[PDB]
Design a protein around this ligand. Structure first.
Ligand code: UXA
Length: 185
């Protein structure tokens, strides 16, 4: 792809984080802690899942960023409406304000309703995310495989400002402790 020149510097918003997440000083890395991280509760925090938002809000234009997923067994990545539900149980779907892909139990799927099987021959270590606000497109790229297309959501109805979205996943197995990292431009 040729989206690299729309690169944006994403930082994580601590105030939205599940209370078990540990965000680095530079706000560019996040991992699951083994306990509550001693923060107060607030109405912004994702309560049920190990999720966090980027601080940046997008309402126009073309945006691109990259995320490192090396050695993780489970994660969700993409973009969501600023006003998505934070508390309780919910599914990742465009109807609920999410445009995401994930890894779970050795398969990759797009967060459509119902979910869509992805066809990845080279397991990605870094994922590129492209948003075209005006066109209503969210695309995902396999940086490990020379930028090959993973998935395109088209005819997106954003219906609000967008935020970068992250889920580091649970670590019930002891094999999913590694962080998500925002990769340098
Ligand atoms: O963004 C949407 N779909 C495209 C990404 C694939 C989308 C979101 C909400 C809807 C909807 C469609 O239809 C009725 O409520």
């Amino acid at each position: 792809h040729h989206h690299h020149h729309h690169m944006v510097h994403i930082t994580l918003d601590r105030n939205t984080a599940n209370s078990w997440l540990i965000i680095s000083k530079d706000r560019r890395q996040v991992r699951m802690g083994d306990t509550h991280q001693n923060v107060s509760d607030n109405k912004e925090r994702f309560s049920n899942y190990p999720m966090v938002l980027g601080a940046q809000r997008f309402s126009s234009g073309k945006m691109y960023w990259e995320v490192d997923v090396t050695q993780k067994e489970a994660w969700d990545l993409g973009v969501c409406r600023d006003s998505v539900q934070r508390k309780g149980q919910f599914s990742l779907s465009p109807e609920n304000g999410f445009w995401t892909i994930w890894l779970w139990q050795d398969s990759y799927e797009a967060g459509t309703s119902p979910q869509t099987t992805l066809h990845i021959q080279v397991p990605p270590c870094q994922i590129g995310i492209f948003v075209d606000y005006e066109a209503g497109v969210v695309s995902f790229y396999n940086i490990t495989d020379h930028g090959s297309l993973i998935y395109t959501f088209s005819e997106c109805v954003f219906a609000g400002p967008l935020r970068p979205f992250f889920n580091v996943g649970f670590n019930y197995s002891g094999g999913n402790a590694a962080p998500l990292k925002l990769c340098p431009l």
